[PDB]
Amino acid sequence: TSWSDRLQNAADMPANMDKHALKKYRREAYHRVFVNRSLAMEKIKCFGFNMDYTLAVYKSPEYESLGFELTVERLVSIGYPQELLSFAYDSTFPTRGLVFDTLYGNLLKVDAYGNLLVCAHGFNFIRGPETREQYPNKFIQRDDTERFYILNTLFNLPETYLLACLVDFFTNCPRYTSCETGFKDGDLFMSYRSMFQDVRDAVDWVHYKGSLKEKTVENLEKYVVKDGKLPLLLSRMKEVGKVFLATNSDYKYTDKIMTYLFDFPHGPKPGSSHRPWQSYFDLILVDARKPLFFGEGTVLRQVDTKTGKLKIGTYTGPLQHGIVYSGGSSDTICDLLGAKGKDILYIGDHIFGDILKSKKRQGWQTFLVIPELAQELHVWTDKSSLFEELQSLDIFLAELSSIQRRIKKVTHDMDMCYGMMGSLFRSGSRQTLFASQVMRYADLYAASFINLLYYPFSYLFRAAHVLMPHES
Amino acid sequence: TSWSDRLQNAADMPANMDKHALKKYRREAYHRVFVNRSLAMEKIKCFGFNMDYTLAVYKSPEYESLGFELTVERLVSIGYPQELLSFAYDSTFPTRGLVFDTLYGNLLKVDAYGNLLVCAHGFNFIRGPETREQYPNKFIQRDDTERFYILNTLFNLPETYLLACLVDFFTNCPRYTSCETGFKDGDLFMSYRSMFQDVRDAVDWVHYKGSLKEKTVENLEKYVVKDGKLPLLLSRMKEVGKVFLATNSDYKYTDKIMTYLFDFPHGPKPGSSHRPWQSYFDLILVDARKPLFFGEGTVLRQVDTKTGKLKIGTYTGPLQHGIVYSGGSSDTICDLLGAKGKDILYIGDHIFGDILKSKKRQGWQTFLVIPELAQELHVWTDKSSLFEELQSLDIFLAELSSIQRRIKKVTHDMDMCYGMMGSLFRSGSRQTLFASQVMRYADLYAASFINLLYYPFSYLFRAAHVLMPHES
Amino acid sequence: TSWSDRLQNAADMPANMDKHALKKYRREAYHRVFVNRSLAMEKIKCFGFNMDYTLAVYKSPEYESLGFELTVERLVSIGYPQELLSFAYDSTFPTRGLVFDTLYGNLLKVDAYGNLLVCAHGFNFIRGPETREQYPNKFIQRDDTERFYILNTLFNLPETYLLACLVDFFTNCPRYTSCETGFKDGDLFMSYRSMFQDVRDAVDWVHYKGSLKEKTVENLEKYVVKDGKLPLLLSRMKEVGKVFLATNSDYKYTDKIMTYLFDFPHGPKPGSSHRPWQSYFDLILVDARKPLFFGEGTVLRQVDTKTGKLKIGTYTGPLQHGIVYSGGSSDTICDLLGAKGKDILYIGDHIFGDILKSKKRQGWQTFLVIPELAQELHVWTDKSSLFEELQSLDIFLAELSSIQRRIKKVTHDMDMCYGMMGSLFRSGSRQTLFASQVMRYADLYAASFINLLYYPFSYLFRAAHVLMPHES
Amino acid sequence: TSWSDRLQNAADMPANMDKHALKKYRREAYHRVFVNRSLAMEKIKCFGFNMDYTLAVYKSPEYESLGFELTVERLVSIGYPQELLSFAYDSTFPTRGLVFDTLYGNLLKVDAYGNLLVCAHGFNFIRGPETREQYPNKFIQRDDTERFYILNTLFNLPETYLLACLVDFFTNCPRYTSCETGFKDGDLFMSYRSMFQDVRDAVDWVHYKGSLKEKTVENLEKYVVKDGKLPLLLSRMKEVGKVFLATNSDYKYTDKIMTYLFDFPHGPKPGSSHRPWQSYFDLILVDARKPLFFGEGTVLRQVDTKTGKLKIGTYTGPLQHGIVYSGGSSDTICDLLGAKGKDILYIGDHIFGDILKSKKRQGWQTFLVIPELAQELHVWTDKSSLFEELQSLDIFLAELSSIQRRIKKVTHDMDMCYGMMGSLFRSGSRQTLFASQVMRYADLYAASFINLLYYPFSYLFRAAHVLMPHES
Ligand SMILES: Nc1ncnc2c1ncn2[C@H]1C[C@H](O)[C@@H](COP(=O)(O)OP(=O)(O)OP(=O)(O)O)O1
Ligand SMILES: Nc1ncnc2c1ncn2[C@H]1C[C@H](O)[C@@H](COP(=O)(O)OP(=O)(O)OP(=O)(O)O)O1
Ligand SMILES: Nc1ncnc2c1ncn2[C@H]1C[C@H](O)[C@@H](COP(=O)(O)OP(=O)(O)OP(=O)(O)O)O1
Ligand SMILES: Nc1ncnc2c1ncn2[C@H]1C[C@H](O)[C@@H](COP(=O)(O)OP(=O)(O)OP(=O)(O)O)O1
Ligand SMILES: [Mg+2]
Ligand SMILES: [Mg+2]
Ligand SMILES: [Mg+2]
Ligand SMILES: [Mg+2]
């Protein structure tokens, strides 16, 4: 059972909009919206979306596996060894939000301070004492962006696994000699940095020049979660405010995917006339180039929706019915919709490019979709005895080293329930960078934005006020 | 009763080192060390200090008043109007950590997200509706460092007040015409940005070229808190680890101030031989240039301690007894003391330059001194009925607008107990940027670092583990 | 008769290597090497080449016309209007080295100081008085690289003409309104800057992603000058020094073009065995990325010459027989050939990327190929009575305004003999930027590098010493 | 006889303004204006000046010696060794325009291409073969501004000599060990780069914080050339155009120096009323900050001429009688005087900051003052047999190595007639960087701007037109 199996199972159920049923449903963690800061929904005047991994949630592990295969094939076609063709995607290895250290070729799971929680070199998980040669303070400067790359999105899952596959391969293939910063093959030296760059380039290439989009659109039922409740929720949002789309994808791809998401023999409700996906938006903007979108952005262009090409010139006109925009900036949305930032709830899956940036640069209110939560919540509840034991052990230890061996063991067994790289949100009792960023920048979060359907228009989402230690 | 009166009253008391007395003393909030993240003191191998406003806590409001007067005098001497000489420092106006908006000439108190909590134009406190012309989303991009200046340190208190004095003066003096971004005096236009720069330049000048240091050292009892417990605590630290000083000040000034701080007719304890201040440090580093110190730093130099001048050349030698360093980097400390970052507890008063930077760049453990806490804690406890009422009102309102007028009123009355700009840490129920940064980057904090004297060597400082909303 | 007709006519003649015949031949300006600074050929130890427009001189106007057509087709395919398909390349319009002003949409011919010599808006040549609204000092800041683009190479001839075609089109098409900085088409505004960028992007696209290379290689006799004397001269160079190729082109294309250039039923001389083109080089380097090549360059890679793909990794080995390099830096050449800069004669056609940069950054000796000289020399000699009249008029005027109308007229008639944009090297008595840069950075220059064949190994190229006015 | 002795001897002579006398006088090279590009004086509408070393020509070697002494004293006061006090300025060592190589501690005299003409390490002049270890291609990348510093102005003569003194001292003092990039003194390493920076800082300090200005103004007759013909020429300029001053110096110093320059018991002519120096200018601008002045510049300020302080605010008014400006940009001059660049003749002594920048950035016409020419012209004429022999030897050698030993010897004997670093303009037959820059950027040049007095208002300065080798 993947997290997308969980999402599609809930997608298959029609909405029971009876008030009491809705209240009952949203008690379950799976259908809940979680609250980091209080938010009065009555004050939201605009609902903003992105498409990829928010409206269009790609099925797992099929879509990751497709991306992986195509990226591998691209590396082989540019000269990587034939053995890469024996690799096969393994969904049990990667967790999202890991950091690739391009100097030493390690995948690192870190906390908000850059402290090391896990370190894997290829598939070798390096124990604490042995990480000290390379990380003498068990720490990285995680904003040293020339050295460290943060794998934030679900699109980064294939490369997360591939990086580990490649380090493992070169390490164990006697044609190469392993060095601290890369591999020697006679008079050729491949640094981990250059290897990483090749992987990144190949992933970009697969998406923008290769066959990934074409292979996705030829089998949308295999690759994309589909939910009759989507048009219902968007139609309801439009009854109380404005609705917009700001996507990094292009118009041709957006139109294919969105047409699929709205392809039912009805509109918002069974029995209602089907309506084109575009009719659900007051403003549609493609090629957004987030995160630059939230600063200077790019020139505002108009899409010719017949051809899918941009009209020539910068668009200087007003918001009009049927127009589709390309590029621009977050100021375009505000200006054209007559909104200030706090009037907007932006619904994103990219912790950096959607959530952190809209919050910090523009003061937008935020909703983070975290698809893996659909399955992490099941693990959390099913294995809760392990976390609770860990908690008791931490308490007992603090109440002034056999206990320390036990803490490592329980931490490991708990973490393995999630995958080889553990929970998205923690390793044992230590929170991840990703968890910290979710708490700090996402006002609301959930396994799916669909969970807003279970709360009324006027709902006041509440979080407890925070007190400093000296105020308690 | 200023916060420095509180600190000096506690300074005047000799240490009662009986175990039970120490435990009893540190129960009181005034003598407590507060904990944001757990910290095992047994693991600290080095104790690091800065001097200004940490070891040498300048008395208030005398020292602020001196800085203010000298800065005013410098502005007049470069051509500002004679009316400035009628200004007098008012300690009830400024709170630390405000942001000066150089575009519109406002002092702003903001939360961690850049939301406006207070906005004052000169001495006019601008109500919420009226801030909307200049701040349509009641928000600033607080990292837009070309526009906004964050007044982080106690050295910034005089300029905080002076900026407000100047805006008030020019606004109400009929020689000038008030414009959105500055003042017109015939064919001269003074922007708030250029005014701010003149103030900043004059404060720097007073410190580095003018008479502030000379006037301070000629009356140290008036200007600097002095505590017989200082040598005691430093001597105890040196029994269990290494002790270092990294100060932005120069050696001549450092030697004058430190000699004063250690000028008692005894050493660590009454009855013990007096020892020179330098004997309390394994490493002494001046001209540190924090925050650059925590990145590339500057060339390591050696001070000639006879002359107070730098020896010519970069110092390439080892740590030796009696040597004093100048410049260098945080790596100098680690290398020469044989320490890794987590072995170090750095004791600072500069939330940005000492605490945030050492934590984020180097993974040092941190202790933030907050001198104002010595008096804010008294207000917090004495006026607790007001905060508690505010809390109940927030609860009652949330449990689904006469109440909203009451929330504004109680928020205002509470805030005024601290000063015209409120508590360092909050406005009503909203936490400040400074509070957020204290919680995020300072592992420990207190009104004085002296409060470490009341905890044993082995102490385990404990903070509760943090859970995400979906983990609760 | 195009300049390439002249070059191919001389190419068709076999070499008569008799000493007296060679001396006689090199007296004619067409077969001469011209000298800006003295150069002792005996001191040259390495001869360096580029390929495009040096070894491989594309035929004119056929190749320009092909580039033009394909660029037009690309613009139409991305949404430019269908009328562009009626454009046809006109070799009589563009001269090389013009500056496009992206603010006002003008092609400018300037001197070394940025003084305006010609200004054309579309096909409207703007008289002096009328240029003053846009250029009040008849001057541009020609290093303001964000505004001005210098069209240095023969590859830039199609876009030179196309830019003028586009400004003319939009100006005269009543669908658009002409503004100072671009064109309005309803709610779309196309700046001259964005138009320019589209043209530049389309030219790049045609070369790197489109069909230009494929169409060139399918008819090499139509598109590329071929000369049996090439292998002869390169073989002679190799008898007295080392020979290298540093080309911005890729290996696959290089191999196709070079194989064509050496495809004769003989090697260096008639009667000799044919040898592969690679055998004529001690070092072959592709993907050079000049001008970056002459600074930091890029990582040194090795080409797999079977596949045409790069081997994975940086190449750390020595110079070996049969190896082909990719990327690297000018230091690669020096290190691997055991050369210092003054030992190298680099033979280039790019005044900036080959000549100025190798001279200024590395102190290489330089030879500039200027293919248009093959026809400009004919005009210069045939119309010499016009220049001589201009000279006499300048003299007579200086010897203290009917004469000034005559100077404009004669200047215009002279310039028109070269084309609508005049000589590469001057407008009337004023030298162009290009001329100045040739004199300043090219030690030697000629219509073809083949002209070195007519000078012996030991030749001392001589230029007169320069004296300052006060030294004369 | 120094160059300033020559200038003051000519200064002492009253002007004979008879037409025939003026024509006769300007035939002599000493009183001539030299012409790099033709310039019609009738077209000049504004005459612009700088003060230091143009209007105010400091006497030599007295002023250099003063600067040297004060700089030495400053270095000793910050910790340099006492032996520096034994140094004494030697005017026979430095020539202007040398390059200090901060890596290897050499003074270099280079041509326009960065080729080495002379290399001195301290006072050791390094022969050609021995320069090859450090400069393998006898070349530097002279725009590598982090490594190389170009000593352009007469203010740089003291530091030119001091740098050589210091390298010599440390090299020969057995307390220090000489290394490739600096000197070791036990555990202190002084790089040539840090030494250079100390010298540069000390020269700045002497000028802006120390006693140089005060010592100059207390003995102006010792330190500043004074000429009754100055007011005459400026008065004549004002009869036919506008006159402005743009100086990097401050108003207080400018007023002292200018008052001295105009302190005669007459105005322009004997018998005429004395007039204040300010009356000779339509526009007076101080604190110009050239070269930044010719780009963005700084905020335009107004000087209070009573106090010498800046009025507070940016000056937004028109040009008015008696106003004095500070900061601004070259656009300030043009706007306020109603001039375009080619209407302006700017008279400067700084080849980079006055001449190159005004020409290249703004298209101003230029006049370079070169005070040393007043004595170099005497050497040039007196030792002309040596240059002529060198010329004949170059000719004879070229007409196909005993001759090469003779060329080195004659080159050396010629160069020594100018000083140990040779002529400003050449070493033997090779022109210097400075010479090249004079020819390229200075339209006119002379030993003094006073030489304009000897040419009528309408004069047409003529230079021969330049032809390319293929045009001859
Ligand atoms: N999730 C992320 N992915 C990629 N880059 C990130 C991410 N979070 C932060 N950064 C980058 C942007 C900045 O260059 C740098 C500063 O990060 P840091 O200050 O440590 O984190 P933060 O949570 O305070 O966010 P911010 O970066 O916006 O300040 O790190
Ligand atoms: N207290 C402060 N004083 C001055 N500048 C600050 C302060 N805090 C942050 N900055 C600056 C440094 C960066 O340019 C920018 C980024 O800040 P921001 O990311 O919002 O805060 P933060 O608490 O995440 O710290 P950081 O700046 O280190 O990421 O703001
Ligand atoms: N032919 C050219 N093509 C493109 N850019 C040029 C060319 N010549 C010079 N530049 C650019 C590089 C620099 O940014 C800037 C400085 O030019 P400038 O100093 O005026 O010319 P130059 O002949 O002295 O060469 P250089 O640029 O190398 O100094 O202009
Ligand atoms: N006389 C000088 N003094 C200081 N810097 C100089 C001087 N001449 C040139 N430069 C600097 C400015 C640029 O960074 C760099 C480029 O110089 P270069 O192109 O070789 O000389 P140039 O005579 O063509 O002038 P420019 O620098 O303006 O292009 O060198
Ligand atoms: Mg997305
Ligand atoms: Mg401090
Ligand atoms: Mg080429
Ligand atoms: Mg000057």
Compute the distance from residue D265 Cα to the ligand 4 centre, in Å. 45
The two tokens of residue C348 are 């280039």
* Chain D contact present for B38, CB below 8 A: no
Nearest atom, ligand 4, residue D351 CA: 1
Whether B26 is covered by a domain: the verdict is no
Rounded Cα distance, A347 and A353, in Å: 12
Rounded Cα distance, A81 and A169, in Å: 10
CA dihedral B431, B434, B435, B441 (to 10 degrees): 140
Q: For the domain that residue C285 is a member of, what is the CATH number?
A: 3.40.50.1000
Residue nearest (by alpha carbon) to ligand 2 atom 25: B356
- Asked whether the beta carbons of C84 and C75 are under 8 A apart, the reply is yes
Whether D456 is covered by a domain: the verdict is no
One domain, residues D67 and D47: no
CA dihedral C55, C59, C64, C69 (to 10 degrees): -120
Residue nearest (by alpha carbon) to ligand 2 atom 12: B143
Rounded Cα distance, A325 and A285, in Å: 5
One domain, residues A228 and A213: no
Task: At C381, give phi and psi (nearest 5°).
Answer: -75, -45
Side chain identity at residue C327, one-letter code:
G
Query: Which listed ligand is nearest to B441 at the C-alpha?
Result: 2
The two tokens of residue A144 are 């040293």
One domain, residues C171 and C157: yes
Nearest to D425 by CA among D357, D368, D372: D372
Q: What is the DSSP letter of B56?
A: B
Taking the CA of residue B3 as centre, how many other CA atoms within 13 Å lie in the half-sphere pointing to its CB?
27
Rounded Cα distance, D305 and D324, in Å: 7
Cβ of B156 closer than 6 Å to ligand 2, yes or no, is: no
Rounded Cα distance, A140 and A127, in Å: 16
- In this complex, the residue of D194, D302, D313 whose CB is nearest that of residue B190 is D313
Rg (C-alpha) for chain B, rounded Å, is: 23
CA distances from B454 to B15, B21, B30, B264 (A): 9, 9, 12, 22
Q: What is the DSSP letter of D424?
A: S
The two tokens of residue C52 are 């495009």
Rounded Cα distance, D403 and C233, in Å: 33
Q: What is the DSSP letter of B262?
A: T
- Asked whether the beta carbons of C425 and D468 are under 8 A apart, the reply is yes
Cβ distance B315 to D78 less than 8 Å, yes or no, reads no
Side chain identity at residue B422, one-letter code:
G
Nearest to D431 by CA among A228, C51, A422, C471: C471
Q: What is the DSSP letter of D243?
A: E
Rounded Cα distance, C31 and C20, in Å: 14
The two tokens of residue C86 are 């009626």
- Asked whether the beta carbons of C88 and C71 are under 8 A apart, the reply is no
Rg (C-alpha) for chain C, rounded Å, is: 23
Nearest to C3 by CA among C47, C41, C53, C39: C53
Which residue's entry shows tokens 């612009």? Answer: D48
Side chain identity at residue A133, one-letter code:
E
Cβ distance B468 to A439 less than 8 Å, yes or no, reads yes
Rounded Cα distance, C445 and C3, in Å: 16
D329 Cβ contact partners less than 8 Å away, ≥ 6 residues apart: D293, D294, D295, D296, D297, D298, D300
Nearest to D307 by CA among B71, B206, B78: B78
- Which residue of chain C is at minimal alpha-carbon distance from A306? C79
Rounded Cα distance, C80 and C95, in Å: 25
- Asked whether the beta carbons of D159 and D203 are under 8 A apart, the reply is yes
Question: Buried b / exposed e across C399-431, counting CB within 10 Å, b at 16+?
Answer: eeeeeeeebeebbeebbeebbbbbbbbbbbbeb
Task: At B424, give phi and psi (nearest 5°).
Answer: -50, -35
Coil, helix or strand for B137? coil
Side chain identity at residue B445, one-letter code:
Y
Identify the H or E element spanning D441: helix D433-441
The two tokens of residue B278 are 């330098």
What single string gives the DSSP state of each residue in C166-226? HHHHHHH-TTSEEETTEEEETTEEEEHHHHHHHHHHHHHHHHHTSSHHHHHHTTHHHHB--
Residue nearest (by alpha carbon) to ligand 3 atom 7: C352
Cβ of C351 closer than 6 Å to ligand 3, yes or no, is: yes
Coil, helix or strand for D345? strand
Rounded Cα distance, D209 and A127, in Å: 60
Residue nearest (by alpha carbon) to ligand 3 atom 24: C437
Cβ count within 10 A of residue D128: 11
Rounded Cα distance, A211 and A206, in Å: 6
The set of chains that have 3 or more CB pairs under 8 A with A is B, C
Rounded Cα distance, C227 and C217, in Å: 17
β-strand A106-110 against A426-427: which pairing, if any? unpaired
Residues of chain D positioned with their CB less than 8 A from the CB of C141: 360-361
CA dihedral B227, B228, B229, B234 (to 10 degrees): 100
Nearest to A139 by CA among C243, D349, B358: B358
Whether C399 is covered by a domain: the verdict is no
Which of left, alpha, beta for C105 (phi over 0: left; psi -120 to 50: alpha)? left
Q: Which of B217, B250, B266 is the last residue of a domain?
A: B217
Rounded Cα distance, B413 and A250, in Å: 54
Rounded Cα distance, A329 and A300, in Å: 8
Whether D459 is covered by a domain: the verdict is no
Residue nearest (by alpha carbon) to ligand 3 atom 11: C143
The set of chains that have 3 or more CB pairs under 8 A with D is B, C
Q: Ion ligand 8 — residues with CB under 5 Å? A: D 50, 52-54, 349
One domain, residues D68 and D133: yes
CA distances from A343 to A44, A462, D28, D50 (A): 5, 18, 82, 59
One domain, residues C66 and C212: yes
The two tokens of residue A142 are 């995680």
**In sequence order, what are the beta bridge partners of C106?**
C101, C121
The two tokens of residue B287 are 């001209």
Whether A415 is covered by a domain: the verdict is no
One domain, residues B72 and B198: yes
Rounded Cα distance, B371 and B373, in Å: 5
Task: At A59, give phi and psi (nearest 5°).
Answer: -70, 145
Task: At D114, give phi and psi (nearest 5°).
Answer: 80, 15
CA distances from D230 to B86, B469, D444 (A): 49, 84, 19
Nearest to B348 by CA among B204, B153, B167, B207: B153
d(CA B124, nearest CA chain D) in Å: 24
Sheet containing strand C116-121, strands side by side:
C124-125, C116-121, C106-110, C99-101, C148-150
Cβ distance A468 to B340 less than 8 Å, yes or no, reads no
Coil, helix or strand for B461? strand
Cβ distance B32 to A470 less than 8 Å, yes or no, reads yes
What single string gives the DSSP state of each residue in C391-456? HHHHHHHH---HHHHHHHHHHHHHHHTT-TT--SSEETTEEPHHHHHHHHH-SEEES-GGGGGGS-
Coil, helix or strand for B183? strand
- Which residue of chain C is at minimal alpha-carbon distance from D465? C429
Q: Which of C313, C333, C368 is the last residue of a domain?
A: C368
Rounded Cα distance, B38 and B464, in Å: 8
Nearest 5°: the CA angle A360, A361, A366 is 55
Residues of chain A positioned with their CB less than 8 A from the CB of B362: 137, 139
CA distances from D340 to A2, B172, D45, D333, D393 (A): 73, 43, 9, 9, 48
Resolution (in Å) of the shown entry?
1.7
- In this complex, the residue of D78, D185, D304 whose CB is nearest that of residue B313 is D185
Cβ count within 10 A of residue D224: 21
Whether C92 is covered by a domain: the verdict is yes
Q: What is the DSSP letter of D273?
A: P
Residues of chain B positioned with their CB less than 8 A from the CB of D78: 309-310
Rounded Cα distance, C319 and C323, in Å: 7
Q: Do you find a cis peptide bond into D61, omega within 30 degrees of 0? A: yes
Compute the distance from residue A294 Cα to the ligand 2 centre, in Å. 18
Cβ count within 10 A of residue D425: 24
Sheet containing strand B182-185, strands side by side:
B177-179, B182-185, B188-191, D314-315
Rounded Cα distance, C423 and C427, in Å: 7
Compute the distance from residue C360 Cα to the ligand 4 centre, in Å. 11
A235 Cβ contact partners less than 8 Å away, ≥ 6 residues apart: A267, A268, A280
Ligand 1, CB cutoff 6 Å, lining residues: A 143, 145, 150, 152, 351-352, 356, 360, 437
Question: How many domains does one find in chain C?
Answer: 2
The two tokens of residue A450 are 């669909």
* Chain C contact present for D27, CB below 8 A: no
Mutation target vs D (from C108, C455, C465; most D CBs, 10 A cutoff): C465
Signed CA dihedral, A274, A280, A283, A286: sign only: negative
Rounded Cα distance, B46 and B48, in Å: 6
Compute the distance from residue C143 Cα to the ligand 3 centre, in Å. 6
Per the structure, the complete domain to which residue C89 belongs is given by: 62-217
How many residues are listed for chain B in this entry? 472
- In this complex, the residue of D340, D373, D469 whose CB is nearest that of residue C36 is D469
**In sequence order, what are the beta bridge partners of A367?**
A347, A444
Task: At C159, give phi and psi (nearest 5°).
Answer: -75, -30
CA distances from B140 to A2, A353, A364, A404 (A): 42, 19, 12, 47
* Chain B contact present for A143, CB below 8 A: yes
Sheet containing strand C300-302, strands side by side:
C34-35, C444-446, C365-369, C344-348, C46-49, C242-246, C283-286, C325-327, C300-302
C98 Cβ contact partners less than 8 Å away, ≥ 6 residues apart: C107, C108, C109, C150, C151, C160, C421
Signed CA dihedral, A398, A399, A400, A405: sign only: negative
What is the distance, to the nearest Å, from the Cα of residue B6 to the centroid of all Cα atoms in its chain?
Answer: 17
Cβ of C145 closer than 6 Å to ligand 3, yes or no, is: yes
Cβ of B356 closer than 6 Å to ligand 2, yes or no, is: yes
Signed CA dihedral, C53, C54, C55, C59: sign only: positive
What single string gives the DSSP state of each residue in D73-138? HHHHHTT--GGGGG----TTS--TT-EEETTTTEEEEE-TT-BEEEEEETTEEPPHHHHTTT-TTS
One domain, residues D212 and D236: no
The two tokens of residue C130 are 């009328």
Residues of chain B positioned with their CB less than 8 A from the CB of A360: 113-114, 141, 143
C233 Cβ contact partners less than 8 Å away, ≥ 6 residues apart: C449, C450, C452, C453
Nearest to B13 by CA among B161, B230, B236, B195: B230
Q: What is the DSSP letter of B352?
A: I
* Chain B contact present for A191, CB below 8 A: no
Identify the H or E element spanning C120: strand C116-121
Using a 10 angstrom Cβ sphere, with 0-12 exposed, 13-18 middle and 19 or more buried, the burial of residue A251 is buried
β-strand A283-286 against A325-327: which pairing, if any? parallel
Cβ distance B79 to D190 less than 8 Å, yes or no, reads no
Breaks in chain C (C–N beyond 2.5 Å) sit after 400
Nearest to C290 by CA among C335, C245, C248: C248
One domain, residues D120 and D207: yes
One domain, residues D175 and D245: no
Signed CA dihedral, C244, C246, C252, C256: sign only: negative
How many residues are listed for chain A in this entry? 472
One domain, residues C152 and C120: yes
- In this complex, the residue of D186, D188, D313 whose CB is nearest that of residue B189 is D313
- Asked whether the beta carbons of A142 and A110 are under 8 A apart, the reply is yes
* Start-end of H helices in C299-401: 330-337, 357-362, 373-382, 384-398
Side chain identity at residue B143, one-letter code:
D
The two tokens of residue B320 are 């030796």
The two tokens of residue C354 are 């080959």
Nearest to D107 by CA among D125, D85, D82, D81: D125
Using a 10 angstrom Cβ sphere, with 0-12 exposed, 13-18 middle and 19 or more buried, the burial of residue B322 is exposed
* Chain B contact present for D400, CB below 8 A: no
* Chain B contact present for A396, CB below 8 A: no
Cβ distance B188 to D78 less than 8 Å, yes or no, reads no
The two tokens of residue A272 are 């209602």
Rounded Cα distance, C113 and D363, in Å: 7
The two tokens of residue C357 are 């940069």
Taking the CA of residue A125 as centre, how many other CA atoms within 13 Å lie in the half-sphere pointing to its CB?
10
Q: Which of C343, C368, C393 is the last residue of a domain?
A: C368
Whether D461 is covered by a domain: the verdict is no
Rounded Cα distance, A385 and A389, in Å: 6
One domain, residues D336 and D259: yes
Whether A352 is covered by a domain: the verdict is yes
d(CA D223, nearest CA chain C) in Å: 28
Rounded Cα distance, A373 and C366, in Å: 65
Residue nearest (by alpha carbon) to ligand 3 atom 23: C437
Task: At D375, give phi and psi (nearest 5°).
Answer: -105, -35
Q: What is the DSSP letter of D187?
A: T
How many residues are listed for chain C in this entry? 472
**Mind spelling out the 3-state secondary structure of chain A?**
CCHHHHHHHHHCCCCCCCHHHHHHHHHCHHHCCEECCCEEHHHCCEEEECCECCCECECCCHHHHHHHHHHHHHHHHCCCCHHHHHCCCCCCCCCCCCEEECCCCEEEEECCCCEEEEEEECCEECCHHHHCCCCCCCECCCCCCCCEEECCCHHHHHHHHHHHHHHHHHHHCCCCEEECCEEEECCEEEEHHHHHHHHHHHHHHHHHCCCHHHHHHCCHHHHECCCCHHHHHHHHHHHHCEEEEECCCCHHHHHHHHHHHCCCCCCCCCCCCCCCHHHHCCEEEECCCCCHHHCCCCCEEEECCCCCCECCCEECCCCCCCCCEEECCHHHHHHHHCCCHHHEEEEECCHHHHHHHHHHHHCCEEEEECCCHHHHHHHHHHCHHHHHHHHHHHHHHHCCCHHHHHHHHHHHHHHHCCCCCCCCCEECCEECHHHHHHHHHCCEEECCHHHHHHCCCCCEECCCCCCCHHHC
One domain, residues A150 and A273: no
Taking the CA of residue B357 as centre, how many other CA atoms within 13 Å lie in the half-sphere pointing to its CB?
18
